[PDB]
Amino acid sequence: GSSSPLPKVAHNLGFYFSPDLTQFAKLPAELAPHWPVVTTQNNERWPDRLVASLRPIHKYSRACIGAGYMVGPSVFLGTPGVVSYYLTKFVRGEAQVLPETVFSTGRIEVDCREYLDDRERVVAESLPHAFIGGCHHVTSKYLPRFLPKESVAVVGVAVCTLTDVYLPDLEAYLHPETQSRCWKVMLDFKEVRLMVWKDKTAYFQ
Amino acid sequence: SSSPLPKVAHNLGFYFSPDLTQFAKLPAELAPHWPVVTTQNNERWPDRLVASLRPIHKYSRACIGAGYMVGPSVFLGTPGVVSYYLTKFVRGEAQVLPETVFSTGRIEVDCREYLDDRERVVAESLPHAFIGDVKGTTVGGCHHVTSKYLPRFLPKESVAVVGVSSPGKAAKAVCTLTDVYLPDLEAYLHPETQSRCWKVMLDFKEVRLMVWKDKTAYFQLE
DSSP states (O other), rough: OOOOHHHHHHHTTTTTTTOOOTTEEEGGGGGGSSSOOEEEOOOOSSSSEEEEEEEEEEEEEOOTOOEEEEEETTEOOOTTTTEEEEEEEEETTTTEOHHHHHHBTTTTTTTOHHHHHHHHHHHHHSTTTTTOOEETTTOOOOOSOOOOGGGGEEEOOOOOEOOOOOOHHHGGSSSOOSEEEEEOEEEEEEEEOOOETTEEEEOOO | OOOOHHHHHHTTTTOOESSSSSSSEEGGGGGGGGGEESSSTTTTOSSHHHHHHHOSSSSOEEEETTTEEEEEEEEOTTTTTTEEEEEETTTTTTEEOOOOBBSSHHHHHTTOOOSSSHHHHHHSHHHHHHHOOTTTTEEEEEOBBTTTSSOOOOOSSSEEEEEEETTTTTEEEEEEEEEOOOOGGGGSSSOOOOOEEEEEETTTEEEEEEEEETEEEEEOOO
């Protein structure tokens, strides 16, 4: 069996249907040859496909490190430095190079408010204005336990914007050459904008 | 006063209660007309299920080792110790309740630990039923609340189904799990044939248990 992306990841690669994965909208097996589709079935029969796997499958399989993932009905947290799933994208039959990206951790989905590890605490401590009052990281001190889920906006997909990205993945951004930079960041294959003010604050827009 | 976990009463047909918070509020005026769970042996309610602390009948069943609640709070069963008594009245007259095993409350309270040393050894004895292991891309044998590869969220069900994971190594879409006191299953773990399917009553629900001696063992719904 294989793990598989959170919906937003496939969505951002342009995938919405799946015959086999229930986090996505259903499409019958029979129609997969004629529509792009996310799956864990590496089915040569379906030419436009995104396949999730736990072992690479072609040189172009991207190892999705540290991502939130799902297995059957369950959601799991990414483990930093550990590969969540591989993704291999086939357009009109042939495997395609994926852009490089960072990954959401799954802390949002599973409502977890903790640092994943000491290294991430150490990064938050190094710029303590970052990601609170606007835009909160999942671990922000000021975030109340009961959020009203309807009115929350997620970075990479309003009461607030919210991210669960693993801080070290981002930490070079927090330290630009210029006094401040509006970066161009790939998160879950979606281009967001991280705005850094060296040594004061940073946040997404 | 001690009460059954919601699933136990559901399995018996009972969803309304005037008194017990864990259930659906029903106003007293209607209690005469629905099956109800209650800590009140009330004659006015012909179809009722009473949770006692001591019996009131030939047919009053002891719920031994069962997880239970007092007000808003869940508590673990202790194995060997009855948690509460239950009596089924139908049209004013007590009924014989089937013989059953009991979920322990661990899933409700998120306590993923053995109840006692004794259970530790059973889990350890049949590790591909009760602990887990991987073969390349596949995990199996994590069918208990104590097992490896478990998600953070577990359905509050007698037999819960979850996806399961060895981060970076293996995954399973479907894995079937309970929090039963493992020794209550010993009777079933040692057959002669290559496989066997038991019928088992768990939390008063009829469930099927596959056993592959001495490889794995898992519950399933009908």
